[PDB]
Design a protein around this nucleic acid. Sequence first.
DNA 1: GAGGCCGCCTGC
DNA 2: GCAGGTGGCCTC
Length: 842
Amino acid sequence: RISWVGEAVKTDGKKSYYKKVCIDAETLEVGDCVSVIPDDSSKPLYLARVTALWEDSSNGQMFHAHWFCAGTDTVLGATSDPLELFLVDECEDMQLSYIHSKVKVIYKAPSENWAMEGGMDPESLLEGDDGKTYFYQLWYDQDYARFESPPKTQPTEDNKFKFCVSCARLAEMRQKEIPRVLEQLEDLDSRVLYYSATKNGILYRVGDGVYLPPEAFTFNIKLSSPVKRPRKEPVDEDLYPEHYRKYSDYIKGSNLDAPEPYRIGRIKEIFCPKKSNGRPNETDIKIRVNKFYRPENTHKSTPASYHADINLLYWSDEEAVVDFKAVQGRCTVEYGEDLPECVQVYSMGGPNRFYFLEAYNAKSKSFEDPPNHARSKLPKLRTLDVFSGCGGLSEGFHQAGISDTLWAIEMWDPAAQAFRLNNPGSTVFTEDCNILLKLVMAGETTNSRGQRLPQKGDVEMLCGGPPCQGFSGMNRFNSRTYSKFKNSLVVSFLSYCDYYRPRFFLLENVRNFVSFKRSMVLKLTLRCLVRMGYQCTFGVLQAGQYGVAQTRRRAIILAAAPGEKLPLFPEPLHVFAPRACQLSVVVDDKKFVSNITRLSSGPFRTITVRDTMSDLPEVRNGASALEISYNGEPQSWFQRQLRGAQYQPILRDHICKDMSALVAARMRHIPLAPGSDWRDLPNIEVRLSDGTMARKLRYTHHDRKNGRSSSGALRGVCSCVEAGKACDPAARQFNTLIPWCLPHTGNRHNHWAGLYGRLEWDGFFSTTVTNPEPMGKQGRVLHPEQHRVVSVRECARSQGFPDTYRLFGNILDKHRQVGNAVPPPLAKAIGLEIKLCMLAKA
DNA sequence: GAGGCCGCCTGC
DNA sequence: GCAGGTGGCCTC
Ligand SMILES: CCc1c(C#N)c(SCc2ccc(CNC(=O)CN)cc2)nc(N2CCCN(C)CC2)c1C#N
Ligand SMILES: CCc1c(C#N)c(SCc2ccc(CNC(=O)CN)cc2)nc(N2CCCN(C)CC2)c1C#N
Ligand SMILES: CCc1c(C#N)c(SCc2ccc(CNC(=O)CN)cc2)nc(N2CCCN(C)CC2)c1C#N
Ligand SMILES: [Zn+2]
Ligand SMILES: [Zn+2]
């Protein structure tokens, strides 16, 4: 009792398409939505749109089902509106007998007045439902967790009766994934030359720059097998009784495992080998490139990288043939003297830009002029920055050219004053953001200081980082902690988003924002954005990959209004230690990644502690002079950038905490070799600067787990080294050069690795802290050579702040301002992705 | 106000 | 077990 209605629309092969069918008491036509029975009766019904109806000579009565995704199957899980569906590129042929019923599915489109329709209370944002039939508003990418406006793919007259948009988009994706050759230049003896080729939607022509993996080719300058570090030569165990705790071969902050950046070539030929009959084998695409040298690839090796621009290359006449499938992306490489602009303007004007001024001759180990054949606005968004701090995120967005931060909210006054000092045109509110929003919603125009409150339409971009105090555990919500979340600053920030409805929205936070409360904080944040009707996504970024010598992972939530394009996450710019670049996120057993494809290498070398601060003058422990001489010119590219173009005769805030006499003696005895920390301290008496004496540490109890030194000395410093015995107060020792508490509890704290630890010139900072303390958790705060902790200026350099960026207050206030900020280079990379969306808006 | 002192959880 | 990820609070 399955009956076709009418004559066949088209007969193709063993298929006869129809526009309408009758099943029992119902009639179905293309475009109708149906439910479909699953094998597991416990599982819910599948829902689909019918995109075609045909009789098959071998399969019987058939239709094409374009499946909807239930909201509960997305990252939103159980927080989803129970009747919300999402478009996905999932579809298949199916027998008509599997249809259970016809269902109503409504497209809930945002209205033309969407930007004025905000103001629902937090309960409505978090838990409110549409309360109607099935509906969709957004398309969903299940691997990247992206909610976007539905695609506008269009059918022709050759497919209108059977058009499946999912089939069409999948076919486009497949074609985009396959390398192809387009033009045709010449036919040689054993190969065919081509003028252009395409890969992953990128067009490559003869003469373009290509990124290649570091293994793609070698240079004529082969290598120098370095004198490797020996196997930890023995030390005097009586002099250094805690050195045994360094049995791990892992050094915090070391760049020994960072990969090489990309090889860079200029396409000389694009070609295919010929078949036996003369035709080209276009499944086998090759390119011949000229090799570019980075400075560190010449005979001068790594030190050549110290002073050179990070995008400086050297031309050479060496050539390599590589598979086209190895290309990692396209880049622009230009001879510097032929630019219509200076090198700095060129380098700041776009991505993937390199330049060369000379050619390198490997045979002669010399430099030459390149050969002739090597030659050949947008209005800013009015931005509100909530929980701005001193303004690192706003500074990076400003550098990207996308925003003017006209309003900022910062409750901690020294940070608010710093933000004002750097942004004279902005209005900085110090009130509770809840109070400010309530005033705006009540129709107030100015706050109690006479500052004008932003109104609907004023705010075009909203960014901030809300604290998660009270719900930053990993365990599941309960009634109390869920109430704390509902009344929290995260939800207040979401309320700002709902009321103002900016074009773009950014929430930044610590990495574990994606995992707090079994990922429910993340899921609810996304749920609120979708409930407002925003496009949105999330991901994790590593700041070191965008140009700071610092490991700092951040969770990022991005949203874009209906009518906008949802931004992509920025591709890594700098290679960085892979152990610090774990960006994936597991939510309810589903592993999510961002759109980022640079997982193994990148265009630029890693930024080091040397890059960051080798130019700063020597200062002492407790340095307090607020304005001093730099004592020399900037040395590295990074320093040239951060000092800026205008000559700065005064270096500011190169001041350090005044550590006590005992702490200073300890710092003076930490060796300079990489990986040095408290475990390298000698066990000696030392006279302190205040006349007092630092004492030897005595070993008073036998530590069965840790054994004894080679002279038979014990290794415990307290009775608690026994199984169940408590701590003996008489066993506590004071004013020892080796701190008593570190051997006291080291066995359960990974030997307190990194406390009193030195940075290394070749390595990177641990996450820049708000108050550098050698015996705190983030204790690796000692200068690579000087006997002091890092200065405020050095922390600001680790964050990528320009040297001209003003700070405010006492030294601890300035450290906290620096340590709480988003690094401007990270903020700038994100902002450039938003700029791409602004320019591409349809 | 410094600096001594040092829990709990998770991914691998 | 190893390494990372969240700082506060005595005591004076
Ligand atoms: C978010 C990923 C996802 C999405 C997305 N996106 C979808 S789309 C809905 C849909 C897609 C395809 C079919 C065809 N049948 C098969 O694929 C099995 N051979 C039916 C329904 N469904 C999902 N569920 C429910 C459908 C059936 N299971 C695969 C269980 C997983 C899941 C999941 N986790
Ligand atoms: C037991 C702790 C808890 C937890 C935990 N753990 C959670 S998880 C968040 C969540 C879970 C399920 C849904 C589905 N409900 C819908 O309505 C869908 N639109 C939405 C959100 N939520 C909670 N409350 C409270 C009232 C019930 N409401 C759901 C609001 C949220 C509570 C609580 N007390
Ligand atoms: C390794 C250093 C360390 C550290 C370090 N670092 C920490 S941090 C603890 C912490 C405090 C506040 C927040 C903020 N709270 C929210 O945000 C609300 N959700 C988070 C974590 N605790 C430590 N113990 C445990 C707590 C304090 N004593 C009981 C003993 C010492 C220790 C130690 N030894
Ligand atoms: Zn299809
Ligand atoms: Zn003890």
